[PDB]
Design an enzyme around this catalytic site. Structure first.
Site, PDB file in Angstrom:
ATOM      1  N   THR A  88      52.886  41.387  66.560  1.00  0.00           N
ATOM      2  CA  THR A  88      51.603  41.613  67.169  1.00  0.00           C
ATOM      3  C   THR A  88      50.716  42.634  66.408  1.00  0.00           C
ATOM      4  O   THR A  88      49.594  42.322  66.111  1.00  0.00           O
ATOM      5  CB  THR A  88      51.768  42.004  68.651  1.00  0.00           C
ATOM      6  N   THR A  89      51.284  43.790  66.014  1.00  0.00           N
ATOM      7  CA  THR A  89      50.558  44.905  65.419  1.00  0.00           C
ATOM      8  C   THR A  89      50.289  44.595  63.978  1.00  0.00           C
ATOM      9  O   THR A  89      49.389  45.169  63.387  1.00  0.00           O
ATOM     10  CB  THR A  89      51.334  46.205  65.635  1.00  0.00           C
ATOM     11  N   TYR A 126      49.099  30.767  76.069  1.00  0.00           N
ATOM     12  CA  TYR A 126      48.025  29.762  76.416  1.00  0.00           C
ATOM     13  C   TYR A 126      48.456  28.609  77.328  1.00  0.00           C
ATOM     14  O   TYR A 126      47.795  28.354  78.347  1.00  0.00           O
ATOM     15  CB  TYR A 126      47.368  29.211  75.156  1.00  0.00           C
ATOM     16  N   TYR A 159      60.557  37.978  73.346  1.00  0.00           N
ATOM     17  CA  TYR A 159      59.420  38.888  73.406  1.00  0.00           C
ATOM     18  C   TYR A 159      58.541  38.483  74.558  1.00  0.00           C
ATOM     19  O   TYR A 159      57.910  37.426  74.538  1.00  0.00           O
ATOM     20  CB  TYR A 159      58.696  38.886  72.078  1.00  0.00           C
ATOM     21  N   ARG A 202      49.190  39.237  77.089  1.00  0.00           N
ATOM     22  CA  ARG A 202      48.692  38.509  75.945  1.00  0.00           C
ATOM     23  C   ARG A 202      48.869  36.977  76.010  1.00  0.00           C
ATOM     24  O   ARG A 202      48.128  36.202  75.345  1.00  0.00           O
ATOM     25  CB  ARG A 202      49.357  38.990  74.678  1.00  0.00           C
ATOM     26  N   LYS A 246      62.486  42.246  73.800  1.00  0.00           N
ATOM     27  CA  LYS A 246      61.399  43.193  73.783  1.00  0.00           C
ATOM     28  C   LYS A 246      60.569  42.951  75.001  1.00  0.00           C
ATOM     29  O   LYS A 246      59.826  41.906  75.086  1.00  0.00           O
ATOM     30  CB  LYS A 246      60.557  43.015  72.546  1.00  0.00           C
ATOM     31  N   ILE A 302      60.265  48.913  70.335  1.00  0.00           N
ATOM     32  CA  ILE A 302      59.521  48.299  69.258  1.00  0.00           C
ATOM     33  C   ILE A 302      58.120  48.846  69.438  1.00  0.00           C
ATOM     34  O   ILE A 302      57.409  48.444  70.357  1.00  0.00           O
ATOM     35  CB  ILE A 302      59.584  46.759  69.272  1.00  0.00           C
TER      36      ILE A 302
END
Ligand SMILES: [K+]
Ligand SMILES: [K+]
Ligand SMILES: [K+]
Ligand SMILES: [K+]
Lengths: 292, 292, 292, 292
Positions: free
Chosen positions: C44-45, C107, C133, C138, C161, C203
């Site tokens: 993500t980051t 989505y 995850y 999100r 995570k 994380i």
């Protein structure tokens, strides 16, 4: 006492909706026998909502009388008007209660400064220890950690019953308050986690029917024996959730009746009798807990 | 009776926190002059939560006196205990009020069947017309369309104040009730939308300080002139939002004092005086509506 | 390695938006020097969202190359189509990554059975360890503890995570999985609480700029030295919150640039340059942390 | 073009998960016969998320072929990376589609200024008309009225699909945009309400299986006949809800197969076959609408 397993005791009623002293005496003996640390008398589970002030005083005085010094009693004392909260609280000074459990103003949704002034003024006008009580799902307002930190400086405001079920609140509050400020869970299903994070006890609905297991669980938690405590909590977890399958205290009064702890499961309108489906869900939780 | 713009009137106080008769008279004359359709006396905006039952009744009786038959008066009459809601309501029989705005029990979070039994019993013990009031953000209880439908069959349950801000409820309720069941908005910011969907009026906070604009908006809306109505709405939309920049009725009381309608903006704790920043905010909203 | 402080590393970019090997080499040396347990590459980051598959493979291979065996690398590998997740994952077998971090489908909001089948199929088609995850804010879907328990039976699915910030998930998952299943926080602001409740590491986004403090904090947490760890966490808490003052990774890339760890804070659209206000908020958090 | 009932058409597949041309033809003929106004090709309901870019384009081009000028076609064209959204969209230039339904970036949760820059850049690199699509439950991103207002000033940004279910957005957006900016519902259950507030149509899932009813409802609504329109709505309201009893398009594909409109109800993982219970549920909804 403001640590360990504290029961949010039911107010047992006869078929007419009046307080049943025989049933109450039985509950109190049971809590003394089971190692419950204290009794919250006429709190949320005690139908504080629907007793008038006369009844409220009667139940608290009857609980103190029956307790007869064997277990400490804490009164439910909130109001959503400050002058009234002060006035109700005066009536309990020198009663023999060890303290008051005082809820954030409900319905009128004050600001944090308003909550600050409310609780500060209540504490100013008594010598009794005050436990703040935060439960946004019932009141429409959320007492935030910052404002708890402001209030914990008031000599008399000695702890909080944090009923949000939001476990981040434990260390947000703890870092703002002194090591002697008591943090108590008001959410049975997360209360063990709450203690693991640094909380000191629970003000419990489950304790109405599993008092010994709850007292052992809280003691092990205080000793840092979380895996041992969690074995108990797993057997109680169905009850921690299903005592809210219909509005509290409908399930827990039914369960008390089923265990022979009270004579009837009668409640006051707008609380309704347990449905058939609810009674099956609760029965199964009780069997999971080993009580049936 | 129950259509057009209905004011959720403030209970103006002196510096001591008691009702100010001169101020109340001025407000009531203002509403008669402005074209307001009715007055809700000692509801939420009127500090129902912080007046005792006698103070409450004194304010209603005074409002009725001052109204002097020129404008209908509806009393705020909630309680979270059914036996009590019935007693509290009985006091207004033969008072001259035309109806009761009765809130859902708050804090104890009853089931839908509980809500059905509570309102049915209230309605059975009075001949006063009853308007249900749904505001889950204050009460922790959401009275659903299906339950409103069941209640609308009770003879003297005649409408609902829907303060959720959820516009889908208008047609959900409307298809379950007869054509003469009144649907009123309890959310200023969405009220014109609510009427556009078939709502009949609004119990408004904004009407305290914009009574003419609100009465004209609601007439335009009932006549199908929504574009024209929206012009007035856009003028008022910052009021509709900023009258809640601090807890109601903190902003609206300040606004009333600034417009010269009341002598003081004093409220009862836990409501607190308006902050400096809230004042500048509400002042800009009054300028935008052209009231200042 | 799948315990301790694991960095969700930025993908440093030049002014054109292309990967900057010099900047990456610096970050990697910094993490080796600071005791970070592992690197999540293109999570993500790392702007997984906006790199094409070629770039994604390039960054992961470049990270492994620069790491040169000194610190383990985990690839971000989710997709919202199962066949595509399998196919992307095949491309990393025998790459040198120790594992994959694979996000719930975003989505399309699958059911829990759909998530079960998705992750089961991905694990079936590789030898690589898979970290699930979960980040509902999100993706629009929430991988629940029950389904995590079903997946943890799959030999290759070795941990989670948990990015919800809902600390009740730690022990709901732990009781359903084996003692070797790894629980890792994906929410910096609650990660210490998450570890106190029984989690094994984090994380972390904060670790991008406070790698040594994060590694010490996680080590103390693993040792049960929570009060010691919490002193560190309090100095990091502003950064844990303000690295999300604008969308991640805008604040943290700005902070890296400010500390001289990367050459530019450039990101790819729809990520925008940090505002002036954001830069002041982040600067102050960095000073609170002692890094400026 | 962009008014009345617009179908969010399913991508019917064979057992292998590839597009079934015979089924697509049958659906498209059904829509021309039924009076549907346009077809959204390979949007959300069309499994945009699980088709690759080539498969996606093949489906659009086929739909256009089969439509054979009898019904306008809008392509689903989202991406969460701006450079990519631009490329993906460029492929349809000169294809024959009349517009693009372009979703907000999903997962990376951009700021409002980010969303502004993303859509502005897409619009600048095509002459295709663009319809914004706001569905925060899938994307984690909420495109606010103020930002829609800024975007509606871009020449070829021509409308919005508002799939929040929040009816207050209709007039918030409508007062910030010109009279020819199209406002379409993306929430079947609230779509008639949405048009009652000034909306112009709906991009509908329900229209897959009730295309005539939906086209007639929308015509009645545009002509001001809301009572009459609501009769059709009440017939369809269980479809509007139960077509989401399992993740879309799981129910609607089953329904299409049961009505004989497509050969198979096959979907791609992570979408799963409909459960037995979902099937009985959707079947009862089809009976209630009189389709079965
Ligand atoms: K204190
Ligand atoms: K009626
Ligand atoms: K495993
Ligand atoms: K435009």
């Amino acid at each position: 006492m403001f640590t360990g397993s504290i029961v949010a005791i039911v107010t047992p009623m006869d078929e007419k909706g009046n307080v049943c002293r025989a049933s109450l005496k039985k509950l109190i003996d049971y809590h003394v026998a089971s190692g419950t640390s204290a009794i919250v008398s006429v709190g949320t589970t005690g139908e504080w909502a629907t007793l008038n002030h006369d009844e409220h005083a009667d139940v608290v005085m009857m609980t103190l009388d029956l307790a007869d010094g064997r277990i400490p009693v804490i009164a439910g004392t909130g109001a959503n008007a400050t002058a009234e909260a002060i006035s109700l609280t005066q009536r309990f000074n020198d009663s023999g209660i060890v303290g008051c459990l005082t809820v954030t103003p409900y319905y009128n949704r004050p600001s944090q400064e308003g909550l600050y002034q409310h609780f500060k003024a209540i504490a100013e006008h008594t010598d009794l220890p005050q436990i703040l009580y935060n439960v946004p799902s019932r009141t429409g307002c959320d007492l935030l950690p910052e404002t708890v930190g402001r209030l914990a400086k008031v000599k008399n405001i000695i702890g909080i019953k944090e009923a949000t079920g939001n476990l981040t609140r434990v260390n947000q509050i703890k870092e703002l308050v002194s090591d002697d400020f008591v943090l108590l869970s008001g959410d049975d299903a997360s209360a063990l986690d709450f203690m693991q994070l640094g909380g000191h006890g629970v003000i419990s609905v489950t304790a109405n029917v599993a008092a010994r297991d709850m007292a052992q669980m809280c003691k092990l938690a205080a000793e840092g024996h979380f895996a041992e405590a969690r074995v108990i909590n797993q057997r109680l977890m169905p009850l921690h959730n299903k005592l809210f399958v219909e509005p509290n205290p409908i399930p827990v009064k039914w369960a008390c009746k089923e265990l022979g702890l009270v004579a009837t499961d009668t409640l006051r309108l707008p609380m309704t009798p347990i449905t058939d489906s609810g009674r099956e869900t609760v029965r199964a939780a009780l069997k999971h807990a080993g009580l049936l």
